[PDB]
From Swiss-Prot, chains A, E, F:
Homology family: Belongs to the CDI family.
Organism ancestry: Eukaryota, Metazoa, Chordata, Craniata, Vertebrata
Comment block on domains: The PIP-box K+4 motif mediates both the interaction with PCNA and the recruitment of the DCX(DTL) complex: while the PIP-box interacts with PCNA, the presence of the K+4 submotif, recruits the DCX(DTL) complex, leading to its ubiquitination.
Protein modification: Phosphorylation of Thr-3 by Akt or of Ser-4 by PKC impairs binding to PCNA. Phosphorylation of Thr-3 by PIM2 enhances CDKN1A stability and inhibits cell proliferation. Phosphorylation of Thr-3 by PIM1 results in the relocation of CDKN1A to the cytoplasm and enhanced CDKN1A protein stability. Ubiquitinated by MKRN1; leading to polyubiquitination and 26S proteasome-dependent degradation. Ubiquitinated by the DCX(DTL) complex, also named CRL4(CDT2) complex, leading to its degradation during S phase or following UV irradiation. Ubiquitination by the DCX(DTL) complex is essential to control replication licensing and is PCNA-dependent: interacts with PCNA via its PIP-box, while the presence of the containing the 'K+4' motif in the PIP box, recruit the DCX(DTL) complex, leading to its degradation.
Outcome after substituting residue 3 to D: No interaction with PCNA; 59% inhibition of CDK2 binding; modest inhibition of CDK4 binding; no change in subcellular location
UniProt effect for mutating residue 3 to A: Reduces phosphorylation by Akt; no change in interaction with PCNA, CDK2 or CDK4; no change in subcellular location
Parent-protein residues present: 143 to 153 of 164
Protein name: Cyclin-dependent kinase inhibitor 1
Conditions for induction: Activated by p53/TP53, mezerein (antileukemic compound) and IFNB1. Repressed by HDAC1.
Swiss-Prot record, chains B, C, D:
Cellular localization per UniProt: Nucleus
NCBIfam families: pcna (TIGR00590)
Protein known as: Proliferating cellular nuclear antigen 1
General function of this protein: This protein is an auxiliary protein of DNA polymerase delta and is involved in the control of eukaryotic DNA replication by increasing the polymerase's processibility during elongation of the leading strand.
Principal cellular location given in the protein's record: nucleus
SUPFAM superfamilies named among the record's database cross-references: DNA clamp
Species in which this protein is naturally found: Arabidopsis thaliana
GO cellular component, one term: cytosol
Length: 11, 255, 255, 255, 11, 11
């Protein structure tokens, strides 16, 4: 499953 | 007002070529510190962080902090028209809706003026802490580019694993399996043998080759690429922009 | 009979490459003065005038004035088969329906014979008086080629204007505006700086970039291109064929 | 077991590029004598005979005679990933269904392992007697390649005829006719002039240019190509693989 | 408007 | 007419 950048760093 | 004069205009051309195929539209942020950008692809799977430090410009005028929203493909089309030895100047009126790119030959016998419309962009920026990665691979950019191209012709996913025995890039697809293992040479006796692998803790992560391959569009910017890995983080792929900045690509893993 | 021996066969190859994409079929007129051609594109918007003087040929036999109607693409396909160092001979029987192109290597270890069918062509030739143009721009052909390619990626029309401040090429399109200003250098210190701008009276005319770009197919013929402009006339774009002739492109303006 | 170590890995890459577009799937036969292959195209119009003698390998282990059925395109895709200076090793387990290609850089700083599935192939092999051809043409491979490319742009069939006056390649098509006559130079004073024509008995045969052109994919293997002709036999087009073997193409004539 | 060569020189 | 390799050499 391809994770998201947002699953690591938040805005 | 904004007026940034970059003697080595080719750097800007290369930078745009490096990011236009990953992100369609993005904001270029100007501050006294430099000309930068941060944007994710449409899937929020990858992120690109660009920084051209103010010290690298011959002339740097940024009265106030500002952001220029732009269609990267259009900006690239215009920059493609500048000669590799041209001095490039980015001009903008703080209360304007257009950006001007001046292309000037060294002798000045030719001066081009390309003007583009700016666009309003509400992009998501992420806070990225300065981490100490478990494994770092510094290798020839051309070799990294070949590895990604080669592996992508075999499969869609590349497993990058670093141990005391070196760094391995592995993929599997319909036609079979393929892996490439790199090790530091006895000495760094030539550019091709300039591979440094720092392993603090072993790391093994899976990534989409399609993204890795897009990152390699920055290859012309540097003879070296640096890959930073950590078990709990997206991989970081960095290319230095001369000695005035960088382009850092971040890619979320497949788990 | 007709028998024209050209030692530098590559010149003929380049000439055909220069005109085949502008005009489909055309007549090659042979006389004691030389091998020539005059034809307009299908829209009668542009005209090409070619002349290879008899003195440039090693052997020149033209018993009577004659015209060979030809499919330029076919002639080009055959000429593409000649080596760049080959001696090329054009042979034809005054009462024949075919033309023969002999390709001969310098050592003669290879001799090729390519024969093509001739066609009847009733083409319109125009009388073109030797005018004294108001402004003339002599510049590197490679630079002119780049300018046209660059501008055409922005818009469809290029406004060429010459004043005492130099020559400006301007275009506007969907992605924005673009202009390039050329000025004579302090001295002609290198090929890239070999730009001469003669301005008797200022001139400003608009032209279709699509045509200008077709003209640049003659670039390999010369390191220099000469652009002649006059307010009441089509622009003339000339490329010298070695020291034995020329290819002159004429393009009607947009008004 | 099977373990063949070839120091000049680029040779294998070139060999595969030479045959993949002619035959889709084929068997590679291994014996103490060498690594070979014999296969016809799907139309049984052409045949390719490859031989890499055991002496050319640095390490050669073939316990028993064996045949590896393979998809040539897939093998080529994998080999494309090996560097031109890589040492290539072909490994296989006599009772296995896969083949392994090891790619190793000279310094060993990089070792790749590409594994492919083997397939069962029941191919037709033909017995080819060692004949003494009536005419033999040894010429620069690049020149033969150009001739075939040039002629194929004119027509589909090439008539190759050898007499005491040299060798002529002729074709005819919609746009006209074309023929190229080669003769031995006064001396072999340079590579381009290295053409040897041995004529015992005159020969004239017609062949499909489409096939001849496929044969020229072996051009990078040698600076020379040898064409052997006989009135009652298919033409033989040979390219030497370094000094360790060859690739021989056979093509049935049009009669 | 695109003019023609024939608007300047005649046959 | 295009002949076949098999018209010259047999399996």
């Amino acid at each position: 499953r391809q994770t998201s950048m947002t699953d690591f760093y938040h805005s | 007002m904004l007026e940034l004069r970059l003697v080595q205009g080719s750097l800007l051309k290369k930078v745009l070529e490096s990011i236009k195929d990953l992100v369609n539209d993005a904001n270029f942020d100007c501050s006294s510190t430099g000309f930068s950008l941060q944007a994710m692809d449409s899937s929020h799977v990858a992120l690109v962080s660009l920084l051209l430090r103010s010290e690298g410009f011959e002339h740097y005028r940024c009265d106030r902090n500002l952001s220029m929203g732009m269609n990267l493909g259009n900006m690239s089309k215009m920059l493609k028209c500048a000669g590799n030895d041209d001095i490039i100047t980015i001009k903008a009126d703080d209360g304007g809706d257009t950006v001007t790119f001046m292309f000037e030959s060294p002798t000045q016998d030719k001066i081009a003026d390309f003007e583009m419309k700016l666009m309003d962009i509400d992009s998501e920026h992420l806070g990225i802490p300065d981490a100490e990665y478990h494994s770092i691979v510094r290798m020839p950019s051309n070799e990294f580019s070949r590895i990604c191209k080669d592996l992508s012709s075999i499969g869609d996913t590349v497993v990058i694993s670093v141990t005391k025995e070196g760094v391995k890039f592995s993929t599997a697809g319909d036609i079979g399996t393929a892996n490439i293992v790199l090790r530091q040479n006895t000495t760094v006796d030539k550019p091709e043998d300039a591979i440094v692998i720092e392993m603090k803790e072993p790391v093994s992560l899976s990534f989409a080759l399609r993204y890795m391959n897009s990152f390699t569009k920055a290859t012309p910017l540097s003879d070296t690429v640096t890959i930073s890995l950590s078990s709990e983080l997206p991989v970081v792929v960095e290319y230095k922009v001369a000695e005035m900045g960088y382009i850092r690509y971040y890619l979320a893993p497949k788990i």
